[PDB]
């Protein structure tokens with residue numbers, strides 16, 4: 001059986017390792033492709049069905065979708081795949097030749113075997129790249145064809161806001177995807193603990209991607225520019241055995257982070273300090289790790305950020321024992337701050353954070 005698993009662009013390999021460790025525990029055989037068909041923010045999972053013997057002595061299925069929904073920290077959506085196809089030249093086909101290609105394609109799909117003729121259903125679409133039709137055209141064309149198809153078999157029941165079964169149709173570049181979205185209208189990154197909403201907060205999946213890349217070992221972990229608290233809370237909710245510390249310049253944000261941590265059940269295990277990271281060595285003497293989503297300093301200045309990174313990183317030099325994991329839009333400010341201060345890049349990545357192409361670096365001190 002086949003699942004399309006989504007996550008942030010540029011973290012597919014991290015999401016893969018995450019997915020394996022999890023399914024291995026079930027005993028399942030499976031195989032996982034990064035970026036099926038070249039599309040980013042995706043994994044195509046192939047597994048055998050997960051059977052056990054139940055209380056009645058009967059073969060019973062274990063939901064793999066449920067298992068992943070419940071336990072993954074990196075995934076956005078778990079979708080049961082019905083088909084994945086390239087439509088050559090679609091975004092360059094004219095509006096009506098496009099809807100045409102779609103409907104005829106979907107009309108062929110045995111969609112009745114994925115939904116009970118008599119469950120409710122909606123379509124939700126995601127469209128992307130340059131096309132001649134809208135995202136709304138897809139939900140429309142795809143919806144027509146599911147409804148028409150299901151009719152042959154009975155009485156189709158449509159419900160936009162409270163479906164029991166969401167079909168999701170994605171068209172990205174020239175790749176079309178149709179599937180059953182098991183995750184729902186709220187994507188997995190939408191955390192219940194997030195009661196204070198930071199204007200520049202880290203998407204929780206990318207937070208765990210930073211945690212993984214750090215290769216933590218029980219040593220103390222610091223978010224010097226913590227904000228809303230995302231990175232530290234994710235790490236506490238992973239049950240991390242080490243000290244966890246967050247420093248945040250602005251009180252409002254820091255009290256937000258404490259409220260977020262209260263709502264997540266982990267406020268006890270994080271030490272939250274109002275404080276200024278360019279004076280870092282006043283707040284601490286030693287930390288094994290530092291993990292931060294740095295302020296991107298949008299707009300200009302005329303030179304705000306270069307100077308912020310330069311000081312912070314000089315302070316960091318003073319206290320860091322193992323590794324730093326950092327995220328920023330400001331490629332230049334960061335790499336000079338890194339260079340001038342005797343840090344060494346041991347990993348660099350590009351990631352899609354919401355809609356911006358962010359840089360992620362892993363660093364150590366040179367002389368270590």
Ligand SMILES: Nc1ncnc2c1ncn2[C@@H]1O[C@H](C[C@@H](N)CC[C@H](N)C(=O)O)[C@@H](O)[C@H]1O
Pocket residue numbers: 198200201202203224225226227228229230231247248249250253275276277278292293294295296
């Ligand atoms: N000199 C400084 N020292 C410490 N923190 C700072 C300093 N300058 C800015 N900050 C904070 O850095 C934080 C960076 C945020 N982008 C972090 C978002 C956070 N990762 C979250 O998910 O909620 C901002 O909330 C700023 O208040």
